[PDB]
Design a protein around this ligand. Structure first.
Ligand SMILES: CC(=O)N[C@@H]1[C@@H](O)[C@@H](O)[C@@H](CO)O[C@H]1O
Ligand SMILES: CC(=O)N[C@@H]1[C@@H](O)[C@@H](O)[C@@H](CO)O[C@H]1O
Ligand SMILES: *[C@@H]1O[C@H](CO)[C@@H](O)[C@H](O)[C@H]1NC(C)=O
Ligand SMILES: *[C@@H]1O[C@H](CO)[C@@H](O)[C@H](O)[C@H]1NC(C)=O
Ligand SMILES: *[C@@H]1O[C@H](CO)[C@@H](O)[C@H](O)[C@H]1NC(C)=O
Ligand SMILES: *[C@@H]1O[C@H](CO)[C@@H](O)[C@H](O)[C@H]1NC(C)=O
Ligand SMILES: [Ca+2]
Ligand SMILES: [Ca+2]
Lengths: 492, 493
């Protein structure tokens, strides 16, 4: 029997949000015990600065440039899957649960999908057997004329909407959702143990603004509401882990914890996380935007309380989980995800690159201890003047710029070991600069010449495709009449 | 019945983010990380000043630099210390920790940097310590021995050489055998004292002070460049110091504490300076990154292993604690800032104390619970900033990180450290949370200030002629130099 796979994917949590990672308030005892009982990655990365493209990247093991989760409307624009998006995960893409099904797995997604809300993009059409969660954010409450409230699904059909059947109180921050997500996870694990190997994609989002937590966890954190959520998610994760041990299926269960992108610094200090020593956060390709916590837990297989400086990618969990199940990745396409079993079980290292993409643009690349910035950008001057700051309290001369700066000819290079916060660019005349530049450009060109970008899915929007009448609305009497609209270019 | 040994490990310019367990990315401190696992970690511990001298005086006196005299009044809120030319130093009126420990039968050794005065009257062996190996000053140089003399290294009463002479530091490569000698002094001392007398060891190393140094086997081993090389060596050294305690079965009767005298020296980063993790600025300022420090406590069988305490802790506390460990009481004829942390260390209790952040003659900021109020703000002057000196590289918080000494006494800048450790978002002045904190914090501040009679300042006068031209012992080595003709004058800070 192949080992169970449990993937814990957080939403907008940063490198500095875990106790073991150096959070001052030390409010994550369960994840801290998971680290003590496993392996911690200090140099792990997501595939994009925001949600959709990263989640697609996890599930495909492929860069958003490859899987289609980007825009070409303008260069280097962050795009995702809002209610009005026309595109979504293509049928050509082979998702992890589709393939695991080859080894007898039974797979469940809990929480946020974000790979398309239209019927053709349903996760049960793309490998998953069961679902409880929403295809979108939990933003609202909407007036149901201009926008409809975001639906929560059980499997094929909606069972309610956020701010309706599933209340979120914005004043207090109260919502029972994380407790339902917990309960879905426990029950699933209970039905599958000793029957079939299971795959659980536990993609919670209480940590996405507007932040929420159940009543018992409200006002317990020193981090305000955002920490309340983090404390609940942590408590929940402890209980998920204890159940694996109480069923003696822990030795045959591989669990991995990570986050889809950096902390949402527009929402700090109350509703956003911490990126620790790193620069900026979500929306950018600086370290704080794409470096993530990363714990691996597999009693008896992964040696307890170790550290690996393996450069890791969220995409690696695609290939690894396949290797865990004794399968091979698709041989008819480029696969970015690497098999990390040699790192996880033997403590070996691998000299791989980390590409930092923002929209249609490779912004930056990391080999070893060096990161080269070919393009730099926080947000435009117009957005900055309107009070949107992606890098609050932070300003690095000629690095954190409000123009999309072209450094393709003469990249801004950092030594991450010496300078994790990307504060001091290497001098252009130095030998260390030259050695890195050659090493990094070599891998980048190679990548780019072998790269045929996919057709972009995130270019077109249409008011009429919003969740007006999800499947199951008729029986609940919750279908809404949609407005009259045409498809047009999304304004990003 | 014998009182436990006390080992104090004091670092020089290391920051809150320089330890693995504290969240350093490269994870290069396995021994301190094992000391944490085997003890108690403090996330909310503080030094008493933004730089060396005043903090080290504060540790040893258990008293604020405003009280013990380690400050200047030449201008308001100026960082001052004890350079070679300083006239003052630790006053005779001050009762230092080793003086007092000697009341419980202790034998005390300082290893490394003193920095409480280099003149004969200020010698550590005149102030409680039985043995010394180290320098009274920095390891800056090499000086031409006409304008300035090279800084001496002492064994006990007499100099045994000078830096960049008998004790070479290579600036090109960063090589120096000093940390290995400091280690050896510590091991040997522990070996002679065990099963004889209870011992106090003040291990104040400084490889991590610019210009940074490490022994050959540790050079080029860190991903943090030379500064990390040092940090790796100090760590390895600390591992061996700990292993010796266990190999002599005196570890259960030995209380060890690790900390740093101030924040990372961000003018020297990225090659020669540390990391302050999530916090703002560093050394020279009273922002969190300047005065919040790592803090581990290790005492097998007494301090429960691998715990965390959010007790607001001060470097001064080690004065009162070490006394309490020895079954003694602090001086009752003077104000004592250091608190006894045995209830925190051995029982896990909490205590609602204030943290005062002084810069020179000015109380800049104060912290109670989760709130910090800035009464004054300042990084450095505009003139110094334009000359390339930046205390907060890559950091700028609007109307908080300012190049003028800003007066917020009427309307303090308040932060919630739990929510906003990097001091980025001041609380709104109209909020109830602001009002609650302001009253709570001003209450303790006034109380402190009304009971406060500042000491006369020791760091006001300098004199070229008092530099280490002819230290005791120079005559036999033939190393005495002729001093220049000068008068005492006001130090330019
Ligand atoms: C699921 C979700 O909320 N998606 C968010 C989107 O709503 C918005 O906040 C965006 C900011 O660019 O980031 C995405 O990750
Ligand atoms: C022992 C030592 O070097 N003292 C230093 C001093 O030399 C200088 O660097 C100063 C900067 O303000 O900081 C002090 O801690
Ligand atoms: C959560 O569930 C409890 C019942 O156990 C209920 O009292 C509470 O109102 C619920 N809160 C929300 C926001 O639905
Ligand atoms: C960032 O710093 C540079 C150089 O000090 C300066 O020109 C610019 O005004 C600063 N920008 C912001 C947004 O703070
Ligand atoms: C340091 O010590 C070793 C002997 O242990 C010696 O060979 C070496 O020359 C010394 N290095 C310096 C720079 O003094
Ligand atoms: C810091 O930020 C402020 C406000 O944005 C700006 O006016 C100033 O230029 C910055 N300070 C420096 C020294 O660059
Ligand atoms: Ca996200
Ligand atoms: Ca210092």
């Amino acid at each position: 029997q192949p080992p169970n796979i449990l993937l814990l994917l957080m939403d907008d949590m940063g490198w500095g949000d875990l106790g073991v990672y150096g959070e001052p308030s030390r409010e994550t005892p369960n994840l801290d015990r998971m680290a003590a009982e496993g392996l911690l990655f200090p140099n792990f990365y997501s595939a994009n600065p925001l949600a959709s493209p990263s989640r697609a990247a996890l599930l495909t093991g492929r860069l958003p440039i490859r899987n289609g989760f980007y825009t070409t409307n303008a260069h280097a624009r962050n795009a995702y899957t809002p209610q009005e998006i026309v595109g979504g995960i293509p049928d050509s893409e082979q998702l992890l649960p589709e393939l695991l099904k080859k080894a007898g797995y039974v797979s469940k997604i809990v929480g946020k999908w974000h790979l398309g809300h239209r019927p053709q993009f349903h996760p049960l059409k793309h490998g998953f057997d069961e679902w409880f969660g929403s295809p979108n954010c939990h933003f609202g409450p909407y007036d149901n004329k201009a926008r409809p409230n975001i639906p929560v699904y059980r499997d094929w059909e909606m069972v309610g909407r956020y701010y309706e059947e599933f209340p979120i109180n914005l004043k207090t921050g109260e919502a029972n959702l994380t407790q339902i997500y917990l309960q879905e996870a426990l029950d699933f694990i209970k039905r599958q143990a000793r029957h079939h190997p299971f795959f659980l994609y536990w993609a919670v989002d209480a940590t996405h603004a507007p932040v929420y937590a159940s009543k018992p966890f409200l006002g317990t954190s020193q981090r305000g509401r955002y920490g309340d959520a983090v404390r609940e998610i942590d408590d929940s994760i402890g209980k998920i882990l204890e159940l694996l041990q109480d069923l003696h299926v822990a030795d045959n269960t591989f669990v991995f914890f990570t986050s889809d992108n950096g902390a949402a610094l527009i929402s700090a200090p109350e509703q956003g996380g911490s990126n620790g020593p790193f620069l900026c956060g979500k929306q950018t390709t600086f370290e704080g935007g794409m470096r993530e916590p990363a714990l691996a837990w597999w009693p008896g297989h992964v040696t307890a309380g170790q550290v690996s400086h393996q450069l890791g990618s969220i995409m690696d969990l695609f290939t690894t989980s396949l290797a865990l199940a004794g399968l091979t990745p698709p041989s008819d396409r480029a696969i970015d995800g690497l098999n990390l079993l040699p790192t996880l079980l033997q403590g070996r290292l691998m000299d791989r690159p980390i590409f930092y993409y923002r929209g249609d643009t490779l912004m930056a690349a990391t080999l070893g201890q060096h990161k080269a910035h070919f393009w730099t950008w926080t947000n435009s001057w117009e957005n900055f003047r309107q009070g949107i700051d992606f890098c609050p309290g932070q300003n690095v001369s000629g690095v954190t710029t409000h123009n999309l700066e072209d450094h393709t000819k003469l990249p801004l290079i950092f030594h991450l070991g010496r300078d994790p916060g990307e504060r001091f660019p290497l001098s252009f005349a130095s030998a260390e600069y030259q050695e890195a530049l050659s090493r990094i450009t070599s891998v980048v060109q190679q990548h780019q010449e072998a790269l045929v970008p996919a057709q972009p899915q995130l270019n077109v929007c249409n008011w009429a495709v919003m969740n007006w009448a999800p499947p199951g609305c008729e029986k609940l009497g919750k279908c809404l009449t949609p407005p009259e609209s045409i498809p047009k270019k999304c304004l990003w």
